Amino acid sequence: AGNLSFLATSDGASLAYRLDGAAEKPLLALSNSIGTTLHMWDAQLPALTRHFRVLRYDARGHGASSVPPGPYTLARLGEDVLELLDALEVRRAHFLGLSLGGIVGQWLALHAPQRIERLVLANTSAWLGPAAQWDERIAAVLQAEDMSETAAGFLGNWFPPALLERAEPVVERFRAMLMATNRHGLAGSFAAVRDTDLRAQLARIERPTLVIAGAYDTVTAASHGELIAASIAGARLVTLPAVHLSNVEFPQAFEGAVLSFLGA
Amino acid sequence: NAGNLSFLATSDGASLAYRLDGAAEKPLLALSNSIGTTLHMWDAQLPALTRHFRVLRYDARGHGASSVPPGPYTLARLGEDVLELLDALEVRRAHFLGLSLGGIVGQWLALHAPQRIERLVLANTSAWLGPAAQWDERIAAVLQAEDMSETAAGFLGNWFPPALLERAEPVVERFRAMLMATNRHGLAGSFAAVRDTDLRAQLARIERPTLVIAGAYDTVTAASHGELIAASIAGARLVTLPAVHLSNVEFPQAFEGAVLSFLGA
Amino acid sequence: NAGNLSFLATSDGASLAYRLDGAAEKPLLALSNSIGTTLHMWDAQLPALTRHFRVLRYDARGHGASSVPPGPYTLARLGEDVLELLDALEVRRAHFLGLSLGGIVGQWLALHAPQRIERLVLANTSAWLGPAAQWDERIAAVLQAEDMSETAAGFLGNWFPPALLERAEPVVERFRAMLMATNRHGLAGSFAAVRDTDLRAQLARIERPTLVIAGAYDTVTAASHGELIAASIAGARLVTLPAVHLSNVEFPQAFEGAVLSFLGA
Amino acid sequence: AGNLSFLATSDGASLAYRLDGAAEKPLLALSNSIGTTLHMWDAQLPALTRHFRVLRYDARGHGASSVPPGPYTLARLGEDVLELLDALEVRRAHFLGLSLGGIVGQWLALHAPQRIERLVLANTSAWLGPAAQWDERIAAVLQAEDMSETAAGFLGNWFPPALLERAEPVVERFRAMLMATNRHGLAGSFAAVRDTDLRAQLARIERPTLVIAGAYDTVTAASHGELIAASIAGARLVTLPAVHLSNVEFPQAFEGAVLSFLGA
């Protein structure tokens, strides 16, 4: 019933979002990996809502949200969060974004610093070029028969071989998210990633930031997160022995790192 | 003549010489000098620095074109000098770069007036230069000297590669002249500020973004000193140059590069 | 024409291009290049280096003026290439400076042929660049390319400040040309050497004096990688420049200074 | 009876030396601080002779040795050790020198590398200028009535206040060494120190070296030892929370650092 609310964006899409935790606590907004839904954070909810009110949403083209055609700009993915915040009459929120969500985070700190408090960037990067590889992934996702190959591509990049070797429920949970993802959502988001190079801009960020990186990350290399930490003035870096979804692989260490940084 | 310098009258009746370089609309970057030098030790860095920032330079209490109160000076007083400069300029907040003694002033400002500091650079500096004994000896010795000659030989000998010194260098002679024109009370007073300083246990409180530059061959402020600072301040970075003590002099490109990239230029 | 290059026929039937610069009586310093480059990446360093050392330079297996065996190359084979160069020159022992891939060759020589190495410099390098997956992908992709254009955009994009690249720089274009002239099998073979490499647990065995140079903004060989090396080798030093990946290119004075002071020049 | 042997040097002095430990073990030679005798090492003897044959000697102008007039050159203090080694038909020895002894060590590694194995430099420095201060100490020691003021000067620089505050036997042991030191020995050695600047030469040393420094050292600053470690290719640095005589203040930590470095 009250599972979801929907935001009509200014350009004609519809974003699904929900709030968890006590209304009076400070707002922490989460933004998702490409190909996932807000349910990728389900396990972090108990620890996080102990201290913050948690805003979650399905990104443009994903999950319970509507699906404009591609390409999406990074700016538009950024405007989406701002419009969510405007809708909730929130002036300022802590922000935690993983991967693509982390790229949205960087954009927000750069173009709407006044809307952000503390900033957490997990398994992400400021530049994933060169760009051709992304046009190839867009052409391939658009022409696929179903998302099966595409999903197996992600999963192979998201988890360690050990978990893939055998069948595990969590792996299939994420497979389902991928299978359910419209190809335009993936292709529009690929285009945003393709067009992004924020490396020369990071040194202009003035928000307290924590960067979480995965040592064995094959999607967004650990070294990309290390560069983010280096270039953002005063940023801290926490590397986990994880692949790409480190909150899934190490929920305790991930939550500990996030909570102590946001003020416990 | 004209407008080379401005002078600030401090609350405790000294006069501090200072000057601004660069376009007024650009963000303010304040530089603080080594003991025994003047604001001209940064002349080489001006062109690159002023491309992006309005640069505030000053001669510390007891030095160069500033007046010379009798020692002892406290660290707190040397920090207040900066705060009063900022007040006079009506600047709420500035970036701060301090080398050596200037770096100690930097750490103090970050501890006691953080709201006045944007980003912090600490070059060839330290949080603790004890044991204190060596400074009392240096105070007594400088006060009793016929002239600043043996004292300059002291500094120059610690500041420069014996290689760089051996070959009569116009740059070395410029630093020799700064020392030779330094009043013994400026030195004595500054040694006392240094003597009383141990910030090590307090660094963990600093919440300004901090870059630490250290010289691998530095005997004044040892590399390990600056490593201890970087290691102690949350989110601090460390750059280590193959320098002795005035790393901006020995490696201006690496030094300016390190500073400018850190400050967002 | 004349005597720009000499060629060594290796034991496994490849040809390695090399040249010596500087006075013959001076101590031997061998340089080993980054993947995707030639010995001309060190041209700027020659004048300062040859003041004190006889400099041996070579194009790695698969690169520049050397011949191009099919991949995979093993690390051990890339190290043996150096040993056979030294043998051909009848040099018992040399200083070694390797940047990136060259640095990995360096660590290997120190582990497997220490008696051939005097002092060791490791610039913008690493002891482990896994996970291995990314290298298989890069091997398959480079083999299938129409030309080396997208591949060069890859390297140049990781190697240089997007600032330095944005402004058409004659130096960048020289590195673009090196990449564009690199045979895909040299790259593919070299990626495999890298892929199979994890020296981390072995570093503690190295007993050559080691200097490690790292770039604070390096995404290829992250600063933490070189810190891990310095931290692991008994008596190793670390110099960190505000560079990306080719720190000799970005800060030649600091880089040459760091090297020369370490090597006793 | 067999307490000491004496070496007639080539320039007409006479050096006292003794050997401890089994004849077949590798030779470790020790060199002393200014103003002390070879008995400053008495406490290190049990642990050291477990592994090495220990050569000790009173430096030129000190202890049981004869006293040429000043000035002494560093080279001559270096030749002295070489002549001791020649006398014992030892080709190569490990060397451990504290303070002035440590300066002799540096000289040996520079001018007679083939005579040295592993090198330990404790509470020492490569340059202690400017020089005037040393001429002032020479003039003052030569004109003193007795060595009482001079001795109290050293002791104040050698120990922490705590040990000086009360009377302790070890402090007086060292006072006696000082009182018994002829003023020409001190003045000749001051001259050697005065004339020394080895900083531009350290990078030419090719012996495995360990540098021991005292954090609270007021004679030879810790930072001087740190520079030594930095400039000597591949040198290790061990800093103890000690003043100037760190083998006296921390005998266990000092011996542990030395033995593990010399190969256990």
d(CA C145, CA C182): 13
The answer to whether the CB atoms of D203 and C235 lie below 8 A apart is: no
- How many inter-chain contacts (A to C, CB under 8 Å) are there? 40
Residues of D in contact with C237 (CB under 8 A): 230
CA distance A79 to A107: 10
Which residue of chain B is at minimal alpha-carbon distance from D227?
B217
Q: Which residue of B has its CA nearest to A238?
A: B235
Catalogue the E-assigned strands of chain A: 5-8, 14-20, 27-31, 53-57, 93-98, 116-122, 209-214, 236-240
Record: contact B257-C237, CB cut-off 8 A: no
**8-state DSSP, C220:** S
How far is the alpha carbon of C27 from chain A, nearest alpha carbon, in Å? 37
Which distant-in-sequence residues (6+ apart) come within 8 Å of A166 by Cβ?
none
CATH number, domain of D175, equals 3.40.50.1820
Alpha-carbon gap, residue B148 to C36, rounded angstroms: 56
Report the residue of D199, D231, D238, D261 to disrupt the C interface, i.e. the one with the largest count of C CBs within 10 Å: D231
Contacts of D199 in chain B (CB under 8 A): 162
Task: Let me know how long chain C is.
Answer: 265
What contacts 24+ positions apart, CB below 8 Å, involve A157-164?
A157/A218, A157/A219, A157/A243, A157/A244, A158/A219, A158/A243, A158/A244, A158/A245, A159/A243, A159/A244, A159/A245, A159/A249, A160/A216, A160/A243, A160/A249
Residues in chain C closer than 8 A to A226 (CB atoms):
219, 222-224
- Asked if B76 and B214 touch (Cβ cutoff 8 Å), the reply is no
Tell me the shortest Cα–Cα distance from C137 to chain A, in angstroms: 11
Q: Which amino acid is at D146?
A: D
Taking contacts as CB-CB distances below 8 angstroms, the residues of chain A near C243 are none
Q: How many domains does chain D have?
A: 1
User: d(Cα A152, Cα A155) in Å, to the nearest integer?
Assistant: 5
Structure tokens at B13: 């009746």
Phi, psi of C93 (to 5 degrees): -160, 140
Residues whose CB falls within 8 Å of the CB of residue D258, separated by 6 or more in sequence, listed in order? D44, D48, D96, D120, D210, D212
Are D203 and C236 a contacting pair at CB < 8 A? no
Amino acid at B135: W
Q: Name the interface residues of C facing B (CB cutoff 8 Å).
A: 216-217, 237-242, 250-251, 253-254, 257-258, 261-262
CB contact under 8 A, A218 and C131: yes
Among chain C residues, the shortest Cα distance to D204 is held by C264
Record the resolution, in angstroms: 2.2
Rounded Cα distance between B122 and B191, Å, is 19
What's the start-to-end Cα distance of chain C, in Å? Answer: 33
Q: Is there a contact between B157 and D218 if contact means CB atoms under 8 Å apart?
A: no
The beta strand positions in A125-225, using DSSP E, are 209-214
Cβ–Cβ gap C210/D234 under 8 Å: yes
- Amino acid identity for residue D27 in this structure: L
Task: List chain A residues with CB under 8 Å of C153.
Answer: 129-130
A neighbour chains, 3+ CB pairs within 8 Å: B, C
HSE-CB of D239 using CA atoms within 13 angstroms: 17
Q: Which domain range does residue A34 map to?
A: 1-264
Contacts of C250 (CB under 8 A, 6+ apart): B257, C161, C164, C215, C241, C243, C244
Cα nearest neighbour of C256 on chain B:
B242
Q: Is the Cβ–Cβ distance between C213 and C249 less than 8 Å?
A: no
Chain D neighbors of C261, CB-CB under 8 A: 203
Mapped onto helix, strand or coil, the DSSP state of residue D130 is coil
Contact of chains D and A by CB distance (3 or more pairs under 8 angstroms) = no
Single out the residue of B39, B36, B38 nearest to residue B20, CA to CA.
B39
Q: How far is CA A264 from CA A48, A255, C150, D25, in A?
A: 10, 10, 46, 60
